[PDB]
Design an enzyme around this catalytic site. Structure first.
Site, PDB file in Angstrom:
ATOM      1  N   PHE A   1       0.790  -1.245   0.000  1.00 14.12           N
ATOM      2  CA  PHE A   1       0.000   0.000   0.000  1.00 14.12           C
ATOM      3  C   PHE A   1       0.836   1.317   0.000  1.00 14.12           C
ATOM      4  CE2 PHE A   1       0.831  -1.488   4.340  1.00 14.12           C
ATOM      5  CZ  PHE A   1       1.377  -0.338   4.935  1.00 14.12           C
TER       6      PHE A   1
ATOM      7  N   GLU B   1      -8.077   9.839   8.801  1.00 13.53           N
ATOM      8  CA  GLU B   1      -8.263   9.838  10.239  1.00 13.53           C
ATOM      9  C   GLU B   1      -7.275   8.930  10.944  1.00 13.53           C
ATOM     10  OE1 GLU B   1     -12.347   8.322  10.424  1.00 13.53           O
ATOM     11  OE2 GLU B   1     -12.799  10.259  11.454  1.00 13.53           O
TER      12      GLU B   1
ATOM     13  N   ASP C   1     -10.048  -6.534   0.350  1.00 11.03           N
ATOM     14  CA  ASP C   1      -8.969  -6.995   1.220  1.00 11.03           C
ATOM     15  C   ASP C   1      -9.360  -7.009   2.711  1.00 11.03           C
ATOM     16  OD1 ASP C   1      -6.484  -8.055   1.696  1.00 11.03           O
ATOM     17  OD2 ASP C   1      -5.397  -6.232   1.199  1.00 11.03           O
TER      18      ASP C   1
HETATM   19  O1  LIG Z   1      -4.112   2.365   3.858  1.00  8.63           O
HETATM   20  C1  LIG Z   1      -3.214   1.558   4.100  1.00  8.63           C
HETATM   21  C2  LIG Z   1      -2.693   1.442   5.528  1.00  8.63           C
HETATM   22  C3  LIG Z   1      -1.776   0.567   5.954  1.00  8.63           C
HETATM   23  N1  LIG Z   1      -1.591   0.819   7.269  1.00  8.63           N
HETATM   24  C4  LIG Z   1      -2.371   1.840   7.661  1.00  8.63           C
HETATM   25  C5  LIG Z   1      -3.104   2.274   6.564  1.00  8.63           C
HETATM   26  C6  LIG Z   1      -4.017   3.327   6.665  1.00  8.63           C
HETATM   27  C7  LIG Z   1      -4.202   3.947   7.908  1.00  8.63           C
HETATM   28  C8  LIG Z   1      -3.458   3.509   8.990  1.00  8.63           C
HETATM   29  C9  LIG Z   1      -3.421   3.911  10.317  1.00  8.63           C
HETATM   30  C10 LIG Z   1      -4.140   4.891  10.979  1.00  8.63           C
HETATM   31  C11 LIG Z   1      -3.888   5.050  12.336  1.00  8.63           C
HETATM   32  C12 LIG Z   1      -2.959   4.242  13.019  1.00  8.63           C
HETATM   33  C13 LIG Z   1      -2.253   3.249  12.344  1.00  8.63           C
HETATM   34  C14 LIG Z   1      -2.497   3.084  10.986  1.00  8.63           C
HETATM   35  N2  LIG Z   1      -2.002   2.201  10.104  1.00  8.63           N
HETATM   36  C15 LIG Z   1      -2.553   2.449   8.885  1.00  8.63           C
END
Ligand SMILES: O=Cc1c[nH]c2c1ccc1c3ccccc3[nH]c12
EC number: 2.7.11.1
Lengths: 7, 273
Positions: free
Chosen positions: B17, B89, B135
């Site tokens: 990603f 967020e 997913d």
């Molecule tokens: O969109 C792909 C992501 C892979 N790890 C993420 C993703 C999106 C948001 C977050 C996220 C938001 C708050 C805390 C940990 C996070 N890890 C991810």
């Protein structure tokens, strides 16, 4: 044995 | 102006990603996550109503981001010369469902039921908004540890929902259904139910049921933990080998195992604080 699996 | 508006903190994660960082929105200190994806890696693009050409993921996130729900919302985005940057967020405090299960083991059914219900609601939301996530997995679920609320992340493997067949897929193979494994074909809702099947087993047993293609197409579900008959029955129904033998979301939510779900507050109070 437990693991993440990528896309 | 991207760099004047957000304060960039530490890397939260990276992979297929792209790269996601912690951040705080300078104006009002709102916690955010900042996600960077390289243009050379986006093979699926869409068009905003606003003329402009964006990655499908932006399209999908704007479709599901209106109002409240169990989806991490897109707050803003930016194009750079070689990437797109997505402002999302960030719950605080948070842990993802993958780390939560690694740390805590198989979850008690009461907790699995609250979590799974909230995922169901969130996935119904996506489908109501014309969005297929593609997913669904513990690693794509964030838990707000104080509110007891689950949030879906990562629509980068998603697609607009349709009723005809899908013949492309870049999500997670061990959550992919057997018709994908054997035929490179699936229908959206029924593939979504199979992956929810894998997710429910993951929760109640402490890890996914299948690692290899032969296990996926075998459709034999062995339980490694004590799980109630009603729960085993839901899991087996979601993991039916024929797509049309899988339950609809309605049928899942009316299953006897899904009755008397805890409220998010209750779930945080009993199980998370
Ligand atoms: O969109 C792909 C992501 C892979 N790890 C993420 C993703 C999106 C948001 C977050 C996220 C938001 C708050 C805390 C940990 C996070 N890890 C991810």
């Amino acid at each position: 044995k437990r693991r993440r699996h990528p896309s | 102006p991207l760099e004047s508006q957000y304060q960039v903190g530490p890397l939260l994660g990276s992979g297929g990603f792209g790269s996601v960082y912690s951040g705080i929105r300078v104006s009002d200190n709102l916690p955010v996550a900042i996600k960077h994806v390289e243009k050379d890696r986006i093979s699926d693009w869409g068009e905003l109503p606003n003329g402009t050409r964006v990655p499908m993921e932006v399209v999908l996130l704007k479709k599901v981001s209106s109002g409240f729900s169990g989806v991490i919302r897109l707050l803003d985005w930016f194009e750079r010369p070689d990437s797109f940057v997505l402002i999302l967020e960030r719950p605080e405090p948070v842990q993802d469902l993958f780390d939560f299960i690694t740390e805590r083991g198989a979850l008690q059914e009461e907790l699995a039921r609250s979590f799974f219900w909230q995922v169901l609601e969130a996935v119904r939301h996506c489908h109501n908004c014309g969005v297929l996530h593609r997913d669904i997995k513990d690693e794509n679920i964030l838990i707000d540890l104080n509110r007891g609320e689950l949030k879906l992340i990562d629509f980068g493997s998603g697609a607009l929902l349709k009723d005809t067949v899908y013949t492309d897929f870049d999500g997670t193979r061990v959550y992919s259904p057997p018709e994908w494994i054997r035929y490179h074909r699936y229908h959206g809702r029924s593939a979504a139910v199979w992956s929810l099947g894998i997710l429910l087993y993951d929760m109640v047993c402490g890890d996914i049921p299948f690692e290899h293609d032969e296990e996926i197409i075998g459709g034999q579900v062995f339980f490694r933990q004590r799980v109630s008959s009603e729960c085993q029955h839901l899991i087996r129904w979601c993991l039916a080998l024929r797509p049309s033998d899988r339950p609809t979301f309605e049928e899942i939510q009316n299953h006897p195992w899904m009755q008397d779900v805890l409220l998010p507050q209750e779930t945080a109070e009993i199980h998370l604080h």
